[PDB]
Amino acid sequence: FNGLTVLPPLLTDEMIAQYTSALLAGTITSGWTFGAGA
Amino acid sequence: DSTECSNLLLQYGSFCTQLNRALTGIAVEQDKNTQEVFAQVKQIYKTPPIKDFGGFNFSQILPDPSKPSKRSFIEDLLFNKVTLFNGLTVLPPLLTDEMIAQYTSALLAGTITSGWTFGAGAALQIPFPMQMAYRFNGIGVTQNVLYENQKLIANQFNSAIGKIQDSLSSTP
Amino acid sequence: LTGTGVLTESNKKFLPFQQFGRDIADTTDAVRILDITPCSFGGV
Amino acid sequence: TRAGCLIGAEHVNNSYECDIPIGAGICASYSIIAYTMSLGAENSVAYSNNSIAIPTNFTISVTTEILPVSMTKTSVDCTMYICG
Amino acid sequence: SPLGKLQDVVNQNAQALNTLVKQLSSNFGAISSVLNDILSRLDPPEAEVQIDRLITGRLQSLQTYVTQQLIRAAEIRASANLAATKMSECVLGQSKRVDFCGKGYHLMSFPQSAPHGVVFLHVTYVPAQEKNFTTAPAICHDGKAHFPREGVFVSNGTHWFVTQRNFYEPQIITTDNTFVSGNCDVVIGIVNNTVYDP
Amino acid sequence: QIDRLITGRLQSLQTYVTQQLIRAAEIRASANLAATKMSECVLGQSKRVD
Numbered sequence A: 001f002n003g004l005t006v007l008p009p010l011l012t013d014e015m016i017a018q019y020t021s022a023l024l025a026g027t028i029t030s031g032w033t034f035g036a037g038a
Numbered sequence B: 001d002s003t004e005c006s007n008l009l010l011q012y013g014s015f016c017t018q019l020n021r022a023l024t025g026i027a028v029e030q031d032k033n034t035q036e037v038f039a040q041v042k043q044i045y046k047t048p049p050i051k052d053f054g055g056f057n058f059s060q061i062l063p064d065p066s067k068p069s070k071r072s073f074i075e076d077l078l079f080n081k082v083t084l085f086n087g088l089t090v091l092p093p094l095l096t097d098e099m100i101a102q103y104t105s106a107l108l109a110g111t112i113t114s115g116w117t118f119g120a121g122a123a124l125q126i127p128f129p130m131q132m133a134y135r136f137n138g139i140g141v142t143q144n145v146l147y148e149n150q151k152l153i154a155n156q157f158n159s160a161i162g163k164i165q166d167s168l169s170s171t172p
Numbered sequence C: 001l002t003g004t005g006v007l008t009e010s011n012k013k014f015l016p017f018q019q020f021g022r023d024i025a026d027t028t029d030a031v032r033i034l035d036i037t038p039c040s041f042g043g044v
Numbered sequence D: 001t002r003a004g005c006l007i008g009a010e011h012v013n014n015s016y017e018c019d020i021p022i023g024a025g026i027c028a029s030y031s032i033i034a035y036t037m038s039l040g041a042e043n044s045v046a047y048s049n050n051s052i053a054i055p056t057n058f059t060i061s062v063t064t065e066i067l068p069v070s071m072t073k074t075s076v077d078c079t080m081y082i083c084g
Numbered sequence E: 001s002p003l004g005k006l007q008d009v010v011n012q013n014a015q016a017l018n019t020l021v022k023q024l025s026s027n028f029g030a031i032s033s034v035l036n037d038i039l040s041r042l043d044p045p046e047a048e049v050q051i052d053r054l055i056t057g058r059l060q061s062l063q064t065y066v067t068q069q070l071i072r073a074a075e076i077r078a079s080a081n082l083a084a085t086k087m088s089e090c091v092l093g094q095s096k097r098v099d100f101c102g103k104g105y106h107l108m109s110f111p112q113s114a115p116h117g118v119v120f121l122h123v124t125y126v127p128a129q130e131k132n133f134t135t136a137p138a139i140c141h142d143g144k145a146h147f148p149r150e151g152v153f154v155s156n157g158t159h160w161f162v163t164q165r166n167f168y169e170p171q172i173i174t175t176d177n178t179f180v181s182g183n184c185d186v187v188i189g190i191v192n193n194t195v196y197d198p
Numbered sequence F: 001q002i003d004r005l006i007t008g009r010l011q012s013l014q015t016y017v018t019q020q021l022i023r024a025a026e027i028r029a030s031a032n033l034a035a036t037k038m039s040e041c042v043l044g045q046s047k048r049v050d
């Protein structure tokens, strides 16, 4: 209110959750293979 | 202790609270740093009274019953070599020197008795020669290399520890 | 006490002995009852 | 103690896990008691030159680690803050 | 209070912001902390010297806040670099580093989102239900020293077997899982036992 | 004169506190490194070179 503003994050909570779900799904369905290529 | 300072500082603001909070946070952070570094285990292991480590000598780094604040001779040299109002005070650390030394003693006992097993859970006793054979296997050297040169490797380790104490005694 | 901002209808209840109302930061918020809300501002 | 003097807590000769760190190896816990914190369980491992301990079972342990990644992005307009 | 680190970070940021807000209303030696009141009750020369005092104080407070914010940002950046390293090593693979991905032998890790951070669920292997055994560095059979390929020689009582280090799976001592290196005269602690030849 | 002295001494205290914070950050980094070294070299064998 006195020139103080809060800039929203670039990545929303939903997008971060989607990243975590993709990482977890790749870990379960592929192990460590997805972290070194296809 | 001048009332005019308080009178002129109450209207100045609350910078003193900021500085006090910063210093308190710094002190808490150092206590946490020592706590994290030295207390890697929750069990204080003790070296057995009999010391048969296949020729390896660890009395140089293990504590002695002479009570030099429960520190080893190398620790004594390290402590001796290091040489150390107006509103400034020094808060004593949460962990004393004896407590840190006993953490160090527990870590040494666990390492020389159980190898690396105590760091992953329950301590598992194993002869020190077999632990060294495992460590040799870790760097890609077969166990027979250790077992057929056990005396030589023990002598080399003892000599290396001797050079370490000689360097810590005279060399600054 | 001069200042700038948008006057707004006030739903808060004052007292007969109260004229001003200051929220957090000790700045004028409500004045005998009307609310003081500064007009929109921000970055570009 | 070397950290000062404590009033209102009864000193005890036991040693427990530290709850309220007073300092210099002295902690306090809830009447309010003051003691010297215990480093942990004290045990002696049965070492021998021809003895080993091998597990016969295992435990699958799931632990949680919390790591901050970012904080709130705050922008301050100096002209508006200082002058208004 | 299981997420004390994130809550502590939020609390420190909020405390710093609130402290800056409170310092906005400090006299700093001036006749009033309200700039508008000073302008509406003073001659321009004295008004501008009081303005100078207020500007100095508020600028000093803002300088202090920006410095603390930069230090906290560096700390958060170090923590995030550590978190990225943990994600890459513990989550995207298996790490041999001790206690980097949880206490015990690390198996895998799972990431979970947090409001201003990350949570790692470290799945690890912990040995349990331990038993005592008698060991020997090698076995002297037919005047030859036999060492285990992988594992260790053990013997409840008299019967000698070979097992693996992290689990008790005794196996009959055999030439396939043992290798010969020299005679049995230089090994210290070697015992006499038979070696099965299949 | 007292007010001028107050400003100078507070400025000195701010500089000291900032230096302590920077040194504390450096010592915290060193302690994190030491804890990592203790964990990966005392509690186990490290395959990392140097």
Ligand SMILES: *[C@@H]1O[C@H](CO)[C@@H](O)[C@H](O)[C@H]1NC(C)=O
Pocket (backbone or CB within 6 Å): B057, B058, B059, B060
């Ligand atoms: C280890 O070294 C110390 C000093 O050099 C000596 O007193 C002690 O007897 C040695 N221990 C063994 C087992 O030889």
Ligand SMILES: *[C@@H]1O[C@H](CO)[C@@H](O)[C@H](O)[C@H]1NC(C)=O
Pocket (backbone or CB within 6 Å): D012, D013, D014
């Ligand atoms: C003091 O400590 C000793 C040993 O722990 C204990 O036997 C004794 O009862 C204690 N005395 C008091 C008054 O706490």
Ligand SMILES: *[C@@H]1O[C@H](CO)[C@@H](O)[C@H](O)[C@H]1NC(C)=O
Pocket (backbone or CB within 6 Å): D056, D057, D058
């Ligand atoms: C290992 O422990 C589980 C329970 O934790 C038990 O059901 C199982 O029988 C144990 N294994 C052996 C070989 O006894």
Ligand SMILES: *[C@@H]1O[C@H](CO)[C@@H](O)[C@H](O)[C@H]1NC(C)=O
Pocket (backbone or CB within 6 Å): D045, D046, D053, E130, E131, E132
């Ligand atoms: C087996 O090892 C434990 C330590 O893990 C020890 O307490 C016990 O005394 C040992 N067994 C025998 C028969 O000595």
Ligand SMILES: *[C@@H]1O[C@H](CO)[C@@H](O)[C@H](O)[C@H]1NC(C)=O
Pocket (backbone or CB within 6 Å): E156, E157, E158, E159
């Ligand atoms: C050791 O255990 C095995 C498993 O049954 C058995 O064959 C052997 O006789 C045991 N030896 C002794 C001395 O208990």
Ligand SMILES: *[C@@H]1O[C@H](CO)[C@@H](O)[C@H](O)[C@H]1NC(C)=O
Pocket (backbone or CB within 6 Å): B052, D049, D050, E188, E189, E190
């Ligand atoms: C273990 O030490 C004892 C002495 O306490 C000795 O009699 C025995 O031969 C040693 N065994 C081995 C395998 O070194």
Ligand SMILES: *[C@@H]1O[C@H](CO)[C@@H](O)[C@H](O)[C@H]1NC(C)=O
Pocket (backbone or CB within 6 Å): E140, E190, E191, E192
């Ligand atoms: C093993 O057998 C050989 C000859 O068969 C003998 O010389 C040696 O002493 C034996 N080892 C032990 C430990 O008795």
